[PDB]
């Protein structure tokens, strides 16, 4: 039949493309990384450069010092054995202290300390990154939108780990470090707090969550519907509308009634996504310091 | 009413049925041989459904739930009341969506456009036909299929995963979950790098796609590109759904124990399987 | 109850950015006008939003919208009923006119320019150091109309050099004369190139560009709506 524009028929590589410099310190950014072919069928085939300023240098040692702690903890708990490691790696766990230590740090390191220390890591390692992506764009003279959707994840993130956990009053109420186990304590949440089901702010998380599926099915279908147009062109397409927006336009509003713009549909993106963990945080952070009892709250309200 | 550059695509032609017969549009709506079968087959399910809400006695929306056929019924035909309104709404939305569907070609046969959007809602469609058509025939009954109410077919879903343990096990359903939390990343970060390009600090020029390529190479050493982004997306989300209705039609049918369990065959692996220390030993 | 303020909060807070969502949604062919071009009367619900300026790369200036909307071409098509909501029948040749899904909007007519300042497409021939790195490279083959005759051959293909891909290629025609068709609407195969789109005695009519070396945002949308036009208006040779 016809190209669907899933996969490019043809690839053509050109220089190295080092970017644009603005009020970059190009002193920080490294040189091109190699050509990924594979990619190429799909997006970019270039890799890099990257920029690893000083900030970069510490979020990247944070965060891997975070894996490491947990990683040696669960070489620890294969008793050092390669075999039992692999087999074994969805079950191991490095668990917060029990409750009985309240906020404080006296817990030993293999009963709550590793997993505070582990913790501290994650924390620097986040919001340096956080700091990270204000920051390039700053230097490209971009607007901040990235940091600011960025802040939206960091927030359910925050409030599962530190802010709830804080106002609960134990690092017990947080989440451990395993597959598995992560995974118990989301089901055990829920049950502890009378399903939250009932939670209208988890109700609304799933209706983004569901919501940036449906939104990025028909932004991302629209897009390659009218890339024989340039229609992936949005920026251009934002500065001087061409056919392309118009039919993209005129699809929806034939089939729904209504229609966005190629700049307006970013800014309908951004926020079904964003929503998704801004709703989602204060659904979880509520839950225990306000509501005990969901389907309970649900009956009164 | 018509966008001001609207009428130079309102031609006719594009239909796959009638002709020109049903070639026209209702204010913003394009309607066609399907939109007629979309009114057609929503209007009926809708009745339907306010029905089945007069037989169960209430009007409130939160309340009005309208069951599939016990089990008992197996894969065949029930008293209105007791399933057959289920049945029969069902044919609607099924006859509803796909009419949606086609109607989306039509559409995008007039426009001149690719048919990826209709493509795309297609996956949907199979979701839902997973849910009340093909896992609820190949268990052998419509009972299996999930209600139409807003609550209730939340309990459908919390019932439903409760019978196999901690739902969280499914392997399918691990997988489909990292499509729609990765698809909700790669969607907040695409909206906020067009605009942020396009909404630059007060006072200065729009940034271009070079601005874009650079911003992400800086911050993770890759960009994907336009037309790479919109690809991305599109093939995030439907496989956060292909690997959602694959996870259901196992469920039930090729497994039916509790999922936590089926992750035993890899530490059952003889090579490691009796080695003391760990967790399991 | 903290819960129900903060809920009730929300969807306080919901309404009023979907009222802002559709609004800043309205920047571009509002307000909506009746079939023959005037205001209509039903504007919606929503206000238009206040105007914002965009700053223009490389001193290209300024577009402020919403903003004074005009089709700024003839559109050469006719009413084919006595009220509202029925198609509009072109008065010509619909590819040559440039309606319907042969449509194509009055764009700037000059190149769009990457961050550096250079056109953005070009030809691989005068793009420094690029070459086809993967896949059958299609210049040098023939190029198939579905009427299943040989229309041209490639001679080259257009890059895209900020995004490192192929966006046209450039097929000459019998006459000598090239003509650019959009990536998206060729199929590249090991023997040639095939455009279901296009029969091959509707090649002569893609519009040309008035410089062989550049391609401004107005030709690249009278080229693509052009060729996307063939599927429904090429059909009969199809
Ligand atoms: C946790 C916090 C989560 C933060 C989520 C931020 C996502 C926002 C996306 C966004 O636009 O970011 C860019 C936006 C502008 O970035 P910029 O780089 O400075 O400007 C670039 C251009 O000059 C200007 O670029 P621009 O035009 O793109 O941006 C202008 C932007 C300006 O953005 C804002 O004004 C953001 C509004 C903050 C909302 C915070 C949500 C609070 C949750 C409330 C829920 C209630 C629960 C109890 O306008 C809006 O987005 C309008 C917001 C609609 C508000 C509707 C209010 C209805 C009230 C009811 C009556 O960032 C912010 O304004 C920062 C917000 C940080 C707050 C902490
Ligand atoms: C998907 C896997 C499960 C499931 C699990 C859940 C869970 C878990 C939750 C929901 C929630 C919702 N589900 Mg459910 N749900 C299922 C199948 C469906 C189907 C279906 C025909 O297949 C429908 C129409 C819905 C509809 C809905 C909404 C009532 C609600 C918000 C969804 C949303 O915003 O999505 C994204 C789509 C958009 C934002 C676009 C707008 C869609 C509108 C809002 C849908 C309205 C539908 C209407 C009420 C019903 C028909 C109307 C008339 C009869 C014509 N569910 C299957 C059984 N669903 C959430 C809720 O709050 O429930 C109370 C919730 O927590
Ligand atoms: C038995 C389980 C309970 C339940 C318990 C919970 C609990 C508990 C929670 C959710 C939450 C959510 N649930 Mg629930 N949930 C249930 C049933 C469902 C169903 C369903 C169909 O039945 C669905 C669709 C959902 C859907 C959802 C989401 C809307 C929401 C998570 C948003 C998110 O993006 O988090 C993923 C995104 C994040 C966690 C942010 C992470 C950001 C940080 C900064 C990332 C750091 C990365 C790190 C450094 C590692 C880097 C590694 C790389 C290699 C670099 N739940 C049942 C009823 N659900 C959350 C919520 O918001 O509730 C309101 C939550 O806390
Ligand atoms: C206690 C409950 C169990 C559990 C039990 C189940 C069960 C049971 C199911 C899921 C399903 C899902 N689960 Mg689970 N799940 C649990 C916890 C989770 C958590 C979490 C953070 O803990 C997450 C993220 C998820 C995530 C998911 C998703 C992968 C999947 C739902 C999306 C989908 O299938 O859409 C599919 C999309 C659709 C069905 C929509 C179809 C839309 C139709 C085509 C159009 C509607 C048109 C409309 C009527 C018109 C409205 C009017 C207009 C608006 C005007 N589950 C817990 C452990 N989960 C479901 C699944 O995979 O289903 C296939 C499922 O059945
Ligand atoms: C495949 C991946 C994702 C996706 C994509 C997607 N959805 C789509 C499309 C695409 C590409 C469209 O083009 C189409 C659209 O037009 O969007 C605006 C659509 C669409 N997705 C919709 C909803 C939707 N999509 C969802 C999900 C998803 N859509 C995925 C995440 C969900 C959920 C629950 O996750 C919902 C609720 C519709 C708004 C719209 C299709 C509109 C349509 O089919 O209209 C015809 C029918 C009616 C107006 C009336 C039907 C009335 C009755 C006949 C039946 C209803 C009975 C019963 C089934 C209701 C049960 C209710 C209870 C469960 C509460
Ligand atoms: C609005 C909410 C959604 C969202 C948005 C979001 N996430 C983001 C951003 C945004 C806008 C970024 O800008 C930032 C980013 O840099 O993306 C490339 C990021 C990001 N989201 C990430 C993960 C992530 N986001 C998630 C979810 C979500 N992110 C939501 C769906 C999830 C889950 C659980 O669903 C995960 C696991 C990181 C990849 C990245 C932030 C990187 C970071 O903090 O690094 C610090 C630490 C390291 C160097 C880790 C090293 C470990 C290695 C040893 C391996
Ligand atoms: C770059 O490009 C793009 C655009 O343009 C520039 C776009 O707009 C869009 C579209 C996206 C938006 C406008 C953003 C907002 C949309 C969502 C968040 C998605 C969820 C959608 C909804 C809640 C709307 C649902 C509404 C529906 C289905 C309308 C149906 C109802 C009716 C009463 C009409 C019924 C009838 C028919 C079939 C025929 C007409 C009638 C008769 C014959 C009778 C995208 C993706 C895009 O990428
Ligand atoms: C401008 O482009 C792009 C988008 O658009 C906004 C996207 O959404 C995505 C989609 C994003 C994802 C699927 C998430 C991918 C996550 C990562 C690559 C990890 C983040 C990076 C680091 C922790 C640093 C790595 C540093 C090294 C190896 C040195 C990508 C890739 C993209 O490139
Ligand atoms: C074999 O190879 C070697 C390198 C050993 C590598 C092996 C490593 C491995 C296998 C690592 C595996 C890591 C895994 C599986 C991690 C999994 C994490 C999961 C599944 C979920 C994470 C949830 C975590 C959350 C919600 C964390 C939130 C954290 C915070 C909000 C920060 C809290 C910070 C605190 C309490 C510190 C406060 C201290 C001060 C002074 C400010
Ligand atoms: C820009 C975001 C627009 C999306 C609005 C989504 C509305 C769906 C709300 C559904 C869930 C409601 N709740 C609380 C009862 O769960
Ligand atoms: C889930 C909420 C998303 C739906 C937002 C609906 C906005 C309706 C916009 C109607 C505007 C109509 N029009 C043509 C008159 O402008
Ligand atoms: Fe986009």
């Not at chain 1, 939108?145 to 947080?174: C, D, N, Q, Y």
């Not at chain 1, 062109?233 to 392309?244: K, M, S, V, Y």
């Not at chain 2, 399918?172 to 909206?191: D, R």
């Not at chain 2, 065959?265 to 967790?279: E, H, Q, R, S, T």
Request: aromatic share 16%; with cysteine.
């Amino acid at each position: 039949a016809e190209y669907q524009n899933i996969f490019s028929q043809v690839q053509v590589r050109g220089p190295a493309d080092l970017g644009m410099t603005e009020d970059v310190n190009l002193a920080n950014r490294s040189g091109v990384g190699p050509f990924s072919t594979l990619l190429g069928w799909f997006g970019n085939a270039q890799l890099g450069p990257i920029y690893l300023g000083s900030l970069g240098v510490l979020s990247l040692f944070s965060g891997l010092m975070w894996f490491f702690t947990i990683g040696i903890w669960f070489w620890y708990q294969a008793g050092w054995n390669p075999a039992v490691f692999l087999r074994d790696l969805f079950f191991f766990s490095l668990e917060p202290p029990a409750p009985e230590y309240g906020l404080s740090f006296a817990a030993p390191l293999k009963e709550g300390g590793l997993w505070l220390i582990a913790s501290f890591f994650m924390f620097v390692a986040v919001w340096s990154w956080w700091g990270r992506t204000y920051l390039r764009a700053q230097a490209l003279g971009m607007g901040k939108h990235t940091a600011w959707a960025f802040l939206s994840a960091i927030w359910l993130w925050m409030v599962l780990g530190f802010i709830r956990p804080i106002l609960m009053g134990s690092w017990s109420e947080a989440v451990p470090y395993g597959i598995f186990s992560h995974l118990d304590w989301t089901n055990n949440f829920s049950l502890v707090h009378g399903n939250l089901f009932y939670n209208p702010f988890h109700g609304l998380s799933i209706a983004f969550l569901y919501g940036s599926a449906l939104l990025f099915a028909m932004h991302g279908a629209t897009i390659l519907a009218v890339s024989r147009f340039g229609g992936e062109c949005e920026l251009e397409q934002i500065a001087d509308r061409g056919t392309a927006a118009e039919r993209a336009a005129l699809f929806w509003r034939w089939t729904m009634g209504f229609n966005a713009t190629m700049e307006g549909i970013h800014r309908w993106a951004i926020w079904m996504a964003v929503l998704v963990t801004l709703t989602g945080g204060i659904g979880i952070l509520l839950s225990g310091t306000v509501v005990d009892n969901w389907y309970v709250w649900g009956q009164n309200h | 009413a018509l966008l001001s550059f609207e009428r130079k695509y309102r031609v006719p032609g594009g239909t796959l049925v009638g002709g020109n017969l049903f070639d026209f549009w209702v204010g913003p709506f394009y309607v066609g041989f399907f939109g007629v079968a979309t009114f057609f087959f929503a209007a009926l399910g809708i009745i339907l459904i306010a029905w089945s809400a007069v037989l169960q006695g209430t009007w409130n929306p939160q309340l009005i739930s309208v069951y599939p056929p016990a089990l008992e019924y197996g894969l065949g035909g029930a008293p209105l009341a007791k399933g057959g309104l289920w049945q029969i709404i069902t044919i609607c939305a099924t006859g509803a969506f796909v009419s949606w569907a086609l109607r989306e070609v039509e559409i995008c046969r007039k426009l001149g456009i690719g048919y990826h959007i209709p493509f795309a809602f297609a996956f949907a469609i199979l979701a839902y036909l997973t849910l009340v058509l093909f896992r609820p025939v190949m268990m052998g009954a419509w009972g299996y299929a999930f209600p139409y109410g807003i609550w209730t077919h939340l309990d459908w879903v919390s019932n439903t995963g409760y019978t196999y343990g901690n739902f969280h096990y499914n392997p399918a359903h691990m997988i489909a979950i990292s499509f729609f939390f990765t698809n909700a990343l790669a969607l907040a970060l695409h909206g906020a790098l067009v605009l942020s390009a396009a909404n630059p600090e007060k006072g200065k020029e729009m940034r271009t796609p070079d601005h874009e390529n650079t911003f992400f190479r800086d911050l993770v050493g890759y960009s994907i590109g336009t037309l790479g982004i919109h690809r991305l997306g599109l093939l995030l989300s439907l496989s956060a759904v292909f690997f959602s209705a694959l996870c259901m039609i196992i469920t039930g049918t090729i497994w039916f124990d509790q999922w936590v369990d089926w992750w035993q065959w890899w530490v059952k692996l003889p090579w490691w399987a009796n080695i003391p220390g760990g967790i399991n030993g | 109850d903290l819960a129900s303020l903060a809920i009730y909060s929300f969807w306080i807070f919901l309404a009023g950015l979907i009222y802002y969502l559709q609004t800043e949604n309205m920047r571009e062919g509002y307000p909506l006008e009746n079939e023959d071009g005037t205001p209509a009367a039903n504007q919606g619900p929503f206000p238009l939003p206040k105007p914002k300026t965009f700053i223009l790369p490389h001193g290209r200036g300024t577009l402020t919208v919403p903003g004074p909307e005009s089709e700024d071409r003839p559109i050469a098509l006719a009413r084919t009923a006595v009220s509202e909501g029925f198609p509009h029948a072109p008065t010509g040749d619909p590819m040559k006119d440039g309606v319907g899904p042969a449509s194509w909007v009055a764009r700037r007519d000059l190149p769009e320019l990457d961050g550096h300042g250079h056109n953005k497409i070009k030809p691989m021939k005068a793009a420094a150091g690029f070459h086809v790195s993967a896949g059958k490279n299609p210049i040098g083959l023939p190029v198939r109309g579905c009427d299943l005759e040989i229309a041209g051959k490639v001679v080259d293909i257009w890059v895209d050099i900020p995004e490192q891909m192929a966006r046209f290629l450039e097929v000459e025609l019998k006459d000598g004369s090239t003509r650019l068709l959009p990536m998206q609407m060729v199929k590249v195969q090991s023997n040639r190139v095939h455009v279901n789109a296009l029969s091959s005695d509707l090649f002569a009519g893609i519009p040309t560009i008035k410089s062989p070396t550049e391609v401004t945002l107005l030709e690249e949308d009278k080229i693509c709506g052009y060729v996307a036009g063939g599927l429904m208006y090429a059909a009969p040779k199809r």
